[PDB]
Amino acid sequence: MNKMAMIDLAKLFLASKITAIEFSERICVERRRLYGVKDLSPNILNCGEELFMAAERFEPDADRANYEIDDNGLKVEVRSILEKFKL
């Protein structure tokens, strides 16, 4: 079970190999896959949760809520999250 799955997803996203929409959907699949998986670094676990929440705030529509972000904003946050956890 690739325990770095969520982090790898984030890297694919920052390199623009996958879109913000693809990232936001796949992150939910990977999170669900790693949910409750014992023998998982807390650093990696929490990094994923923050990536998951960052994705939740993403909305492609121009009429998004003021607290929501576009793909550029998601890119900035994802990078910030990975650096925070030094991943």
Binding site: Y35, G36, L45, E49, E56
Partner: protein
């Protein structure tokens, strides 16, 4: 004339945007269509109508929102101040975000 899924607390549009979380509510279907969006809609209503589901906290960014939590499934459903469905997912008690919510109600 609105879509058949537009009623009560839901809109087909919102359900479509949040289907990515359907897996947290017992819906493993990978395909997103009217049938699966309906399953998702029904699953959310079942969560909200559960006797074990109770109000707990808020999703601060969505002002005045109320979150409804179920200790058994660990799922939360966020309802806007106007009562409309916003989103939902499973709380992970082992993560700092999960613990913060359980201890303070802040999602």
């Amino acid at each position: 004339l609105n879509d058949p899924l537009d009623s009560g607390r839901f809109s087909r549009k919102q359900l479509d945007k949040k289907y990515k979380h359907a897996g947290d509510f017992g819906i493993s279907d990978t395909k997103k269509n009217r049938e699966t969006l309906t399953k998702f809609r029904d699953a959310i209503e079942e969560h909200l109508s559960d006797k074990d589901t109770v109000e707990k906290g808020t999703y601060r960014r969505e002002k005045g929102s109320k979150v409804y939590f179920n200790p058994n499934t660990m799922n939360v459903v966020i309802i806007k101040s106007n009562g409309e469905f916003l989103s939902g997912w499973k709380i992970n008690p082992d993560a700092d975000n999960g613990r913060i919510y359980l201890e303070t109600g802040e999602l």
